[PDB]
Design a protein around this ligand. Structure first.
Ligand SMILES: [Mg+2]
Lengths: 39, 101, 49
RNA sequence: UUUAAAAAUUUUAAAAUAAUU
């Protein structure tokens, strides 16, 4: 689980740090939104 | 006006010189041929360096040669391994410092 | 086990590395087939049983 | 049709350590 947390999904040998940080910010943004969840 | 100023700024920001004890040895060919910035099994997408940041190869050759000369035994071929962040990110880190002068 | 004891073959997964390190590809590019297969393949003589 | 070579200058003025004339 720790190495999977390291990599994008496992390895990090197929993702530039540019796109990697972009998608990390994207996922962190959509993390807790309520789309992923009186008479 | 010639000799664009991306080199003087780094030369003024960083203080990395050849120590005293290396004066009797042949460190020049060690810098040139035996500290390789292309890692052993090819490209990595992390060790890539942007085209307009050539000064970073200097610091990389520093760190390779020092880490190789520190250990006992024989001097060995040392290859670049991985840069956390990335080539461009580390270059931007050095470049803000060079700019702030 | 006894196949390992008898067989003359010997799997050394540095052939793959030495053949993939000679690939010519640029650096201003966000994809690299050599690195991709080296990651997918992971040559290591840990478990070739 | 895309990439890239990037400058190797000085003699660097002073203060400390070491070697020498
Ligand atoms: Mg005398």
């Amino acid at each position: 689980a720790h190495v999977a947390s390291h990599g994008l999904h496992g390895n990090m040998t197929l993702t530039s740090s540019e796109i990697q940080r972009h998608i990390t910010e994207f996922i962190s943004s959509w993390q807790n939104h309520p789309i992923v969840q009186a008479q | 006006m010639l000799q664009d100023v991306n080199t003087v700024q780094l030369a003024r920001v960083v203080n990395l010189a050849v120590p005293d004890t290396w004066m009797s040895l042949d460190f020049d060919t060690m810098f040139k041929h035996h500290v390789k910035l292309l890692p052993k099994d090819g490209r990595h997408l992390n060790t890539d360096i942007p085209p307009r940041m050539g000064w970073l190869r200097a610091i990389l050759r520093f760190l390779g040669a020092g880490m190789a000369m520190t250990a006992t035994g024989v001097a060995v071929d040392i290859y670049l391994e991985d840069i956390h962040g990335g080539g461009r990110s580390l270059g931007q880190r050095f470049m803000t410092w060079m700019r702030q002068e | 086990v006894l196949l390992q004891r008898i067989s003359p073959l010997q799997i050394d997964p540095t052939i793959i590395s030495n053949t993939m390190s000679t690939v010519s590809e640029s650096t201003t590019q966000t994809l690299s087939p050599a690195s991709s297969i080296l990651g997918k393949l992971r040559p290591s003589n840990s478990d070739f049983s």
